[PDB]
Amino acid sequence: DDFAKLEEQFDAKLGIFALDTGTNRTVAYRPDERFAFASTIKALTVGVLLQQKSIEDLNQRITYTRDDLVNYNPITEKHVDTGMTLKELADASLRYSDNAAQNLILKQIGGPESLKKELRKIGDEVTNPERFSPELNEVNPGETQDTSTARALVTSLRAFALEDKLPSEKRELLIDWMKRNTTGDALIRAGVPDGWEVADKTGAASYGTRNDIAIIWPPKGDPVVLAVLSSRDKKDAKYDDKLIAEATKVVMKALN
């Protein structure tokens, strides 16, 4: 098995689940193993923002200071003086993984416990949002706060992006943002041929956790939804993006 081999090669533990929505074929490898979701949660978080706001409501302007800024604020740091609309915060959070943007959105939806409630409402009993960004990244093995599984992230991302947890114009915003992600070139995108459209959201945390979740549109045929998660046994361990890229090529082989 190629997935076992990857784990061997990169001294890491993989979580994989992929679903071909056209065939209902799946590819699983530790699909129900828990991993820190890290910033992949940003995607489900915007899912819930969109469900709870009209499109026009995303034009509301959010004011903030350097106190609402945290460790990684690539877009938010530019706009302290003017603020940002919810729409521009969605963009920043999904496409640059802006942590402060995530916290600001999370506050608009009522916080982690309110995100959790909303995910339970759409059918996800697995994903456990507990903390703000960045501290959600600090997860020790055995703990369950701020964790999910490859199976559940796929199911939940599909529910918002492709099914009926959102109306079509809102699913379109979500997919556009995710399609135009900037943080993912060496991950799922590097394990798919060019001209296969990918919408993804990356994550990284402690214990060398390195995640990517995606919807992949092959040139014709229905989309594949895919989570590829990984983690290692030392708290301060490095991850290797190539593992996600290689895993991704294995999934596509197995599905075709």
Decide whether 45 or 155 has the Cβ nearer to ligand DWZ.
45
- Whether 201 has a binding-site annotation, put simply, is yes
Min dist CB 75 to a copy of itself, Å, is 4
137 binds, among a copy of itself, ligand DWZ, none (CB under 5 to 8 A by kind): ligand DWZ
Alpha-carbon dihedral 231, 74, 51, 152, rounded to 10 degrees: -10
Residue 39 CB contacts under 8 Å (≥ 6 apart), including other chains: 97, 99, 102, 133, 201, 202, 203, 204
- Residue 229 sits at φ, ψ, to 5 deg, of -125, 155
* Partner whose footprint covers residue 77, from a copy of itself, ligand DWZ, none (CB < 5 to 8 Å by kind): a copy of itself
Start-end of H helices in the chain: 2-10, 41-52, 86-96, 99-108, 112-122, 150-161, 168-179, 241-255
What is the contact surface with ligand DWZ in residues (CB under 6 A)?
A: 38-39, 72, 97, 99, 133-134, 137, 183, 202-205
Q: Would you say 12 and 208 are in contact if contact means Cβ atoms under 8 Å apart? A: yes
Beta bridge partners of 20: 224
Nearer to ligand DWZ, 16 or 38 (CB): 38
In this chain, which of 130, 163, 185, 240 binds a copy of itself, going by CB under 8 A?
185
**75 secondary structure, DSSP code:** T
Nearer to ligand DWZ, 97 or 108 (CB): 97
- Shortest distance, position 145 Cβ to ligand DWZ, whole Å: 14
Tell me: does residue 66 bind a copy of itself (CB under 8 A).
no
In contact, 26 and 150? CB cutoff 8 Å:
no
**Interaction mask 204-233, a copy of itself, x per CB under 8 A:** ---------------xx-------------
CA–CA dist 19, 195 (Å, integer): 20
Is 202 part of any known ligand binding site? yes
Nearer to ligand DWZ, 53 or 153 (CB): 153
Output the smallest distance, CB 202 to ligand DWZ, in A.
Answer: 3
Query: Using CB distances below 5 to 8 A depending on partner kind, what does residue 183 bind out of a copy of itself, ligand DWZ, none?
Result: ligand DWZ
**Nearest distance, CB of residue 178 and ligand DWZ, angstroms:** 12
For a copy of itself, the closer of residues 81 and 113 by Cβ is: 81
- β-sheet bridge partners, residue 61: 85
* Side chain identity at residue 149, one-letter code: T
- Residue labelled with tokens 């061997």: 8
Q: Provide the minimum distance between the beta carbon of 184 and ligand DWZ in the complex, in angstroms, as a whole number.
A: 8
Taking each helix axis from N to C terminus, what angle separates 86-96 and 99-108, rounded to the nearest 10 degrees?
140
Task: List residues binding a copy of itself (CB under 8 A).
Answer: 74-79, 81-82, 96, 176, 179-180, 182, 185, 194-196, 219-220
